[PDB]
Amino acid sequence: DMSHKEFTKFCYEVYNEIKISDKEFKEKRAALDTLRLCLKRISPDAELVAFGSLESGLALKNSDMDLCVLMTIALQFYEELIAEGFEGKFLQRARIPIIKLTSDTKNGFGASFQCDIGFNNRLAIHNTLLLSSYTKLDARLKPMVLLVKHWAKRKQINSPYFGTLSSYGYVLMVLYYLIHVIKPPVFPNLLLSPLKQEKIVDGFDVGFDDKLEDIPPSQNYSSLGSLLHGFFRFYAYKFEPREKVVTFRRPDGYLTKQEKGWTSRYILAIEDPFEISHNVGRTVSSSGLYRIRGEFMAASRLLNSRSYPIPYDSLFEEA
Numbered sequence: 001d002m003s004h005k006e007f008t009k010f011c012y013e014v015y016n017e018i019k020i021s022d023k024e025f026k027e028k029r030a031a032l033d034t035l036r037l038c039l040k041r042i043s044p045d046a047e048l049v050a051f052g053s054l055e056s057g058l059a060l061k062n063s064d065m066d067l068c069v070l071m072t073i074a075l076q077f078y079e080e081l082i083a084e085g086f087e088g089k090f091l092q093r094a095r096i097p098i099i100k101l102t103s104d105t106k107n108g109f110g111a112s113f114q115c116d117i118g119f120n121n122r123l124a125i126h127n128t129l130l131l132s133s134y135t136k137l138d139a140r141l142k143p144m145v146l147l148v149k150h151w152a153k154r155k156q157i158n159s160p161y162f163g164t165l166s167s168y169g170y171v172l173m174v175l176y177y178l179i180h181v182i183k184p185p186v187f188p189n190l191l192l193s194p195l196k197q198e199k200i201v202d203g204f205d206v207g208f209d210d211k212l213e214d215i216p217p218s219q220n221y222s223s224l225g226s227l228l229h230g231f232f233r234f235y236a237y238k239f240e241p242r243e244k245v246v247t248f249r250r251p252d253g254y255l256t257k258q259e260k261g262w263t264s265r266y267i268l269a270i271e272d273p274f275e276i277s278h279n280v281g282r283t284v285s286s287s288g289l290y291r292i293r294g295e296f297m298a299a300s301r302l303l304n305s306r307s308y309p310i311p312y313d314s315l316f317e318e319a
């Protein structure tokens with residue numbers, strides 16, 4: 001596959017530009033160490049677990065950590081963190097308790113240090129296990145995801161709070177394309193594997209075929225450039241957000257918003273692979289979806305261009 005040699009070259013250069021460095025990764029793991037020790041100072045029965053992009057390997061540089069306390073203790077933890085010289089915010093008695101650390105004055109992790117600490121978020125820990133597994137399965141996934149995230153931030157469509165879509169949402173659109181759209185698939189669907197064993201946590205099946213070494217190498221040999229082009233095209237032109245659900249529970253990836261009963265927020269429907277009642281795209285508005293689709297189409301057009309060379313840089317330019 002040399003269909004996208006130049007786009008691919010550019011893609012890997014950008015990737016090496018934006019990927020989290022090994023020194024920042026090391027700092028983040030040392031901060032987790034520090035934070036786990038502080039937690040162990042208040043209860044021996046509480047555990048501190050990383051999840052999200054740092055844990056699965058899908059992290060951009062200058063990214064925030066996603067932490068989870070596993071085991072009323074939140075308040076106590078919060079107070080010890082501040083006493084320890086950390087700066088942060090927390091609202092006791094919140095439905096979803098959250099400690100947001102925004103700074104460190106004493107522990108060496110910088111005035112810009114940020115992480116969110118949730119409590120008993122086991123589903124996020126499991127979906128992170130899935131994403132880790134897939135990044136282990138194929139070497140093209142990590143860079144593809146970093147590039148999609150970078151693009152979505154640059155284009156201003158990575159704002160859940162402001163009508164667009166979480167980074168996690170983007171990762172799932174990527175996986176779904178890799179699994180159920182592209183032929184041949186880069187990836188099998190690990191949830192639907194005949195070898196998958198059910199495993200119930202907080203009411204949902206988080207079981208998946210996790211025996212990676214028994215998974216055969218991808219029969220798709222496309223280049224990174226080709227995969228990205230195909231992805232942008234699928235969401236620009238083929239996927240129908242008004243009627244379809246991105247899903248990981250159908251052998252052919254076909255799911256209608258009406259079977260799902262997701263017909264009244266469901267502008268963009270992305271069914272979480274484990275938390276099946278959660279629409280990861282719940283934050284996408286009518287206007288946010290129009291802007292998202294607009295960006296998919298412009299990206300598609302850029303890469304379908306007839307001229308040469310193609311100004312690939314515009315793919316990650318602002319606005």
Ligand SMILES: O=c1ccn([C@@H]2O[C@H](COP(=O)(O)OP(=O)(O)OP(=O)(O)O)[C@@H](O)[C@H]2O)c(=O)[nH]1
Nearest residue numbers: 051052053060063064066124128166167168280
């Ligand atoms: O709807 C959601 C959102 C998030 N999560 C859980 O939150 C984690 C982080 O959610 P993010 O959207 O922040 O993922 P990310 O780490 O890849 O994004 P960046 O910081 O790099 O911009 C996810 O990886 C997932 O485990 C959910 O389980 N469900």
Ligand SMILES: [Mg+2]
Nearest residue numbers: 052053064066
């Ligand atoms: Mg994050």
Ligand SMILES: [Mg+2]
Nearest residue numbers: 118121123124
């Ligand atoms: Mg979450």
Ligand SMILES: [Mg+2]
Nearest residue numbers: 233234237238
């Ligand atoms: Mg097409």
Ligand SMILES: [Mg+2]
Nearest residue numbers: 298299314315
């Ligand atoms: Mg563009």
